[PDB]
Amino acid sequence: MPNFFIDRPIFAWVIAIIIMLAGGLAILKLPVAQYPTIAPPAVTISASYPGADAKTVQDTVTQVIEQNMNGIDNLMYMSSNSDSTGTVQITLTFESGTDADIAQVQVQNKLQLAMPLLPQEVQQQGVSVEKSSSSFLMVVGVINTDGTMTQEDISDYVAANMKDAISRTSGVGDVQLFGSQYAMRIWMNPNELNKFQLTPVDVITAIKAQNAQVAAGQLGGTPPVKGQQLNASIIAQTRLTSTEEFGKILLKVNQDGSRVLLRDVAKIELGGENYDIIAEFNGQPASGLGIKLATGANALDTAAAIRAELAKMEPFFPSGLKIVYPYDTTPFVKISIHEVVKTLVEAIILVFLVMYLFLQNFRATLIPTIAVPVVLLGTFAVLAAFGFSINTLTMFGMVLAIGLLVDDAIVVVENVERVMAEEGLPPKEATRKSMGQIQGALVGIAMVLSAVFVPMAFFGGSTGAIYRQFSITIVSAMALSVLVALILTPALCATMLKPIFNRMFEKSTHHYTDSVGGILRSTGRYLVLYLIIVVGMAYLFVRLPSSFLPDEDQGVFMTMVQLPAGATQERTQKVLNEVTHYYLTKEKNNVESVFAVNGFGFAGRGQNTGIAFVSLKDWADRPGEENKVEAITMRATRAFSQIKDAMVFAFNLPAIVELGTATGFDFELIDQAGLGHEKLTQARNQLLAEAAKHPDMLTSVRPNGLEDTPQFKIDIDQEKAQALGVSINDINTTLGAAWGGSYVNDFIDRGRVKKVYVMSEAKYRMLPDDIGDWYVRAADGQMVPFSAFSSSRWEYGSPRLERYNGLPSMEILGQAAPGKSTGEAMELMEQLASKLPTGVGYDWTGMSYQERLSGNQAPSLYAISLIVVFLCLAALYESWSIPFSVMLVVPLGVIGALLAATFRGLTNDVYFQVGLLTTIGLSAKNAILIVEFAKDLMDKEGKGLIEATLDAVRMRLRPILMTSLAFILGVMPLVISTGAGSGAQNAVGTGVMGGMVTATVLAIFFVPVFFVVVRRRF
Amino acid sequence: TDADIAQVQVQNKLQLAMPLLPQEVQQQGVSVEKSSSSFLMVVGVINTDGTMTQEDISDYVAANMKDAISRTSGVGDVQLFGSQYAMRIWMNPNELNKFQLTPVDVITAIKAQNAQVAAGQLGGTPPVKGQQLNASIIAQTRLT
Amino acid sequence: EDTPQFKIDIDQEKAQALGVSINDINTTLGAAWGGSYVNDFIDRGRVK
Amino acid sequence: PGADAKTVQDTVTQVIEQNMNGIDNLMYMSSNSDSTGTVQITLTFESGTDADIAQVQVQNKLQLAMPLLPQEVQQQGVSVEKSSSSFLMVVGVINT
Amino acid sequence: EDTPQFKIDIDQEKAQALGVSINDINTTLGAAWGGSYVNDFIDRGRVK
Amino acid sequence: GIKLATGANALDTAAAIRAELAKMEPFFPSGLKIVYPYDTTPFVKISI
Amino acid sequence: ERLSGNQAPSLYAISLIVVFLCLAALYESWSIPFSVMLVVPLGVIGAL
């Protein structure tokens, strides 16, 4: 096939221009993102029943919805949480590859069918079904420095003048609000209700039948009467649109024309729909707007457009209102991708330099300089064929594949040069002879590398996509590389190559051949040495930490504050304020801003939690290892242990926000007999105590829930209520409206529909004794206090009740101890769970579910890959024994990478594994080429298995050294990288360099030995 | 025809007529499912001992077995050969007439005294300045 | 095939004269003879 | 029903229109609300877009706006469906 | 183009003083002018 | 009585159902047992 | 109509490039598909 192109170079140039144009077109139509879709599709039903506890929402909302979630296709599992704030979160996780839209629509259809069974308040609030995806493209905070506007005003302004236009920006899949827009709070005063002989139910009824919209009709409407000449629609009632307009609502007139209005017994104002969460930014009040990227969209773009829109909005803002960005990841991904492109360009330049250093012919060095970029461009086209994007994983896979691209070009060009330098042939004949020499070797190498890399794309689970990205971006690169070795390089070597330090290299080569001959004189020692190397490689591989992905200092981190049970919103403050003060006083030069959010947390949503999104300055302003995120979080968590009130921990965001800590499991106890909640807590405590007796394997085994807290139970005497003439419904409505609020109806503020909330004033619903201030009107206009027909006490109840697959459950988290694989800890956990009281089951969720379901498919995939590689090698050569001489070079390339990983303290993560595979592939390529040359010399020339091998290794030494020096020097910046995004590139570079050094320093002394010892064995 | 799209379209059309149905029909539950006509399989549950009658076995199957099997991928429909437990109030017309009561009164009393009531929280947001307590309030619970 | 059934005519005017209203008549005739799902309850932690 | 164009534009049109933001392959979107109370928020997509997938995308995006809509439309029901813009044929029926 | 419209406004205090509730006035106006849809019936076996 | 969804495979659905039954079996109250009076997929398996 | 008017020149350019490249590949020269690219205006002015 290359011989078809040597005499036909214009065709090769044309079909290379096609590849270049396709790559250029695809670069612009490839999306851009920090990461692909890793987590399996999940749909999160969210419901809100205001004022309820965990038990009420579980019994009336969670169970009803869960019992109607049947008939949905490809459902891995579901887990529901019911909080004491009245919120229900049911997350259904589906199979990987399941269409997210279809799953969401099926879930929402089942929810719509189950809606009539839900309480009226839940239906009024609404139940939202939405897909869960990447955390946030960008968090657009809005602050008011002047302090004139409170947080509610800022949130209302954001909801009015920002969400509508930001959503119109291209690439913005959805937007979220960090606050509650305006909503009219009628603040009931029990003293005036008792005075004016009123009750909250009367207020609710008056507001309902004082603000509604009514259909009216038309003048001259059809059917018309004969002679009609006008037709105008009539208007009857409009919703109130002013505070004093609600103030004038008539509640009662008494008997002497009292004319008591709404404002007499209550305060009418504009406030927030929800007061649970208050957000601040460096102390001053603030708001936010969470932004999510669309499914297909640029990350560098569609984030700069948002900044442009905010800049456009800036002049049209109230005085003192400005925009800040406490969280953004566009600069980080931009810098990482720029570093990757710079690394590729540097690799091309150093290949040019080394190839001129070895081959003094300048015109020969331009052949890869043209060939190498083209393949890269083609790779992008292949991505456009498979619908991939410009991910971090894809660019790092291309970085790893550049080493195979460069040596694939160098080998053929060096062979052409060596042919015309040794035989003095014209460039065309020399190129033809060289392409004849390595005609089938390139195809065999391509098949071997495909068999090595394709099976890694078939791993199942969340980790399957991560491996698939690299597998595709490397297999496509190799498939295009073999073509560009058979197409552009021969034509360039023919039409762009003239006909017709060295001394030290010649002296070393002659000395090298003597060393190889001396080694071949006695091959016994070099086989036991190889066995020792293999044993050491196995020992290092078995004893090595494992990880998912290297956590990187993305420029931000988080601080979590967890006040004890029963803490208030103001107790989280002056503790969340101390964190801000510490960050903006003791770390002024490293921390640019902090975004404190109160009452949000991570385990629950109560008032005793909070989180601060600490955003550091630019990496240019953070010199040294002490100003990095890792070295700052430890100092923060050391300085936060002095707080003896809350429990404050500072940590860094994971590389992937979805799944992390691959060494940890996600065990979950299930109650499969209706034992209850106390018995399930006892079983969980027993399991925790039993697991605390095995510190050698299980470490930090903790529950993922909230322990029981005191609650105020009011029991109403039905007989007393009947005797006193007060209805149970009236009492319940009064209590719920006073102490929990009641979303009554809607109104129109400024052309937007806001809610109208009715709730007691703050000072009258604080202490239990305040219940004595509330009276219920009996049938005969008589007020009875709550102290007459009811009693109250304190009892322990759960603040957050969770269920798994429709059964009560308790989530237990933990990690395997160092030196112990996670699968070795899951078996111990499920052995401990087998001695629990009867009726208590167990199950694995999340990452543990993926690990248990996938099983040990990696050894099977490796076995089938090895079988296919052996078959391809036995095809390329003819004898069944020759392929062993190639398959015995893998440990030589693995041992160096293992040494580098151990010395640098790295971890056996995805990047290290892919780099190990790359080194294995390149070493196998070198062995394939050497043994092919040796076999060809033995066959076509009839040499005696010793001079043939020596000649083959002598003529193969130069390309191997050239490619090793070009590729080691091309990844040195990755190894010595210490800037932004220098944990992923360091991890992917150190292992590759370590493997590649020892895959060529000593493999050149072993492949001839392997070939010789195999040949004189069968 | 694609089954998923057909089900989505027919359910979208059904949602229009859903509000027009009687409240009893809506609260019983209208179900739209894509499934075959013949039974793929039948899983019977029996008791070797005589300690549980037909109702007991049917209730156990409905409560602890039907829910999870109905969610198994590829299962389009599950028909229970029985019915789970429900609080059956067998009225007595003679006794109802003796005390001058009607079934409407019984229904009203059951609705009033078997409700799960949400009663807010102690120290709920927005709190008054200087608050040290925040606990939920338990008004009423469903009978068990 | 066609089957016998019990057609019971409620007289609206006679019901109004007697003082009863035809909402409790229908509610009684339905709840007594055909059952009436009232609300839910919690049996062994499950909604029934 | 009952509300004029101005009233129904802010309570229905202005509530549903902005939610239709992250929908794949959408060229444009035009809504109209008249004094009868009816509204029609059409969504013209890019040519070649799979129609029945865009329909479910619009449906699941609309269901995020139902809580914000007034109760009176809920009993009427919002109908989302693929629509043309011209009559294929008209079948008149007369009485000779 | 823009059309003239008829606006009817009700005095809530006056209506309550005179003994008529808003819940009656609204539905009376709607039924009289808008045309109220009460319920269904059977015409030749079809629900109308 | 379990009926498979349209377009689903019978054999893998039956296998999943049997796996779910095996998972449920340890928590059965003493006395209960599971029988299969209308299993049809064994015929398909035997024919293949 | 506006979209088609906007995208017509790019269509012409890409068609010309494809024809030029395929002719160069087939006829193994760059001057051969350059004496053909000059007769295109002669055939286009006729259509115009």
UniProtKB/Swiss-Prot annotation, chain D:
Induction: Positively regulated by MarA, Rob and SoxS transcriptional regulators (at protein level). Disruption phenotype: Loss of susceptibility to contact-dependent growth inhibition (CDI); inhibiting cells still contact the target. Disulfide bonds: none annotated. It is found in: Cell inner membrane. Belongs to the resistance-nodulation-cell division (RND) (TC 2.A.6) family. AcrA-AcrB-AcrZ-TolC is a drug efflux protein complex with broad substrate specificity that uses the proton motive force to export substrates. (Microbial infection) Involved in contact-dependent growth inhibition (CDI), acts downstream of BamA, the receptor for CDI. Its role in CDI is independent of the AcrA-AcrB-TolC efflux pump complex. Homotrimer, with large domains that extend into the periplasm, interacts with AcrA and TolC. AcrA may be required to stably link this protein and TolC. Interacts with AcrZ. Part of the AcrA-AcrB-AcrZ-TolC efflux pump. This is Multidrug efflux pump subunit AcrB.
